[PDB]
Amino acid sequence: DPGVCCFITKILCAHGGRMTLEELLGEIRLPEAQLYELLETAGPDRFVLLETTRSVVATTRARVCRRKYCQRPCDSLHLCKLNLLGRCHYAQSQRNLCKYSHDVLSEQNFQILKNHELSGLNQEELACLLVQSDPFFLPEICKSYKGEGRKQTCGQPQPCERLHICEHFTRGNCSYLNCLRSHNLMDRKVLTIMREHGLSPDVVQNIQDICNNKHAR
Ligand SMILES: [Zn+2]
Ligand SMILES: [Zn+2]
Ligand SMILES: [Zn+2]
Ligand SMILES: [Zn+2]
C-alpha cells in the first residue's frame, strides 16, 4: 500500500532539510558517484544540489490544497498550515475544533504522500519538507510592490507588513532574467517578517536555495 520509504529523503528531513554531501555520504556509506546517481534520478524537484564543497537541500512537488471549498477529487494535501508552523491555537485550546486537519498522515493524504514518494515519513519530517517547499507557508507578498528603485504606493500612513519580494520567484515561475522585483529572501527586513510568521533564517535559506535552483531552469 505505502510506497517505498526513501533513505535519502528520510535522512535529509531528520537533519533539518539540508546536509552537506560529505555528511550524506557518511550516512549512506556509498562512493560519491553512486550517491550522485540516486540524487540525479530523483531530480532537482526533489533534491537540490548546490555549492555552499556541496550540499543537498530536500524538496518535493507535493503541495497543500489551495481551494477555498474543496470537494473530491483533489490531488493536494489537506492540513492545517498554521499548525505545521506552530501557530494554530487549536493545538492548545479544547474549545471547538480547527477546520483543517492537524494530522498530516490522514487517510485523505495517504495516496498523495505515496504519489510523491513520501511514505514512511513522520509528521515532523513532513513538516520540515513542506515548510521549505510549498510557498503556501510564506507570509503574504505585497501586491503594491512593483520593483526596486521605485516610490512605493504602500507604507503610508503605516508601514507595509507584506514581503517586498517577487511572488513568481517564490513559486518557481519568474521568467525574468533581470527581474525588477527582489529575489533576495535573506534581506534583513524579509527575515523579520519570515520569523514572525514562524520561519527561521535557516529555513528561509533553504527556500532561497530551492527557489534559486528553480529560477536557473
Ligand atoms: Zn483539496
Ligand atoms: Zn489548525
Ligand atoms: Zn508593500
Ligand atoms: Zn522575479
From Swiss-Prot:
Region (N-terminal domain): 1-217
Modification after translation, per record: Phosphorylation by GSK3-beta enhances its antiviral activity.
Motif (Nuclear localization signal): 61-68
Tissue distribution: Expressed in the kidney and liver.
Expression induction or repression: By type I interferon (IFN) and viruses.
Compartments (UniProt record): Cytoplasm; Nucleus
ZnF segments: C3H1-type: 65-78, 80-102, 142-164, 161-185
Residue ranges crossing the lipid bilayer per the database entry: none
Superkingdom: Eukaryota
Domain remark text: The N-terminal domain is sufficient to bind to viral RNAs and promote their degradation. The second and fourth zinc fingers are involved in binding to specific viral RNAs. Contains a divergent PARP homology ADP-ribosyltransferase domain which lacks the structural requirements for NAD[+] binding. It is therefore inactive.
Family: Belongs to the ARTD/PARP family.
Record function comment: Antiviral protein which inhibits the replication of viruses by recruiting the cellular RNA degradation machineries to degrade the viral mRNAs. Binds to a ZAP-responsive element (ZRE) present in the target viral mRNA, recruits cellular poly(A)-specific ribonuclease PARN to remove the poly(A) tail, and the 3'-5' exoribonuclease complex exosome to degrade the RNA body from the 3'-end. It also recruits the decapping complex DCP1-DCP2 through RNA helicase p72 (DDX17) to remove the cap structure of the viral mRNA to initiate its degradation from the 5'-end.
Record note on quaternary structure: Homodimer or homooligomer. Homooligomerization is essential for its antiviral activity. Interacts with EXOSC5. Interacts with EXOSC3, EXOSC7, DCP2 and DCP1A. Interacts with PARN in an RNA-independent manner. Interacts with XRN1 in an RNA-dependent manner. Interacts (via N-terminal domain) with DHX30 (via N-terminus) in an RNA-independent manner. Interacts (via N-terminal domain) with DDX17 in an RNA-independent manner.
Protein name as annotated: Zinc finger CCCH-type antiviral protein 1
Gene for this chain: Zc3hav1
Whole-protein residues included: 3 to 225 of 776
